[PDB]
Amino acid sequence: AQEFVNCKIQPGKVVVFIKPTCPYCRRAQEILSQLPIKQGLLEFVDITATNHTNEIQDYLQQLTGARTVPRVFIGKDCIGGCSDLVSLQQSGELLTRLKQIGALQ
């Protein structure tokens, strides 16, 4: 399953692949949704609701360098997982990363 993730991301959206069975996806949800971002851009896309985690996660491994979730895509740039997301929040690098894609408002 390649097209699901591939077509779900675009530039000029903050797409995030998640599963509700990751405790880490709940972190990323507050972490990201705490920040003032263009309405509709933050989209937590699911990897078990409508698909095959097992396939998509492996595809994400190839496409982004890691399979483990949450997996934040700030406008066709995968920033990494929640470990990286924490740096970019605390360092503030995330804010710059986002506003390029026309997010913060």
Q: What residue spans define the domains of the chain?
A: 1-105
Pull the structure tokens for residue 80: 């990494």
For residues 105 and 38, is the Cβ–Cβ distance under 8 A? Answer: yes
According to CATH, the topology of domain 1-105 is Glutaredoxin (3.40.30)
CA distance 28 to 102: 20
Terminal Cα-to-Cα distance of the chain (whole angstroms) = 34
Experimental method: NMR
Q: Strands, DSSP E only, in 1-105?
A: 14-18, 42-46, 71-74, 77-80
Q: How many CA atoms lie within 13 A of 95 on its CB side?
A: 8
CA distances from residue 32 to 3, 12, 43, 54, 88 in whole angstroms, order as listed? 25, 16, 10, 25, 10
Half-sphere exposure of 2 (CA within 13 A, CB side): 2
Residues with Cβ within 8 Å of residue 50, at least 6 apart in sequence:
none
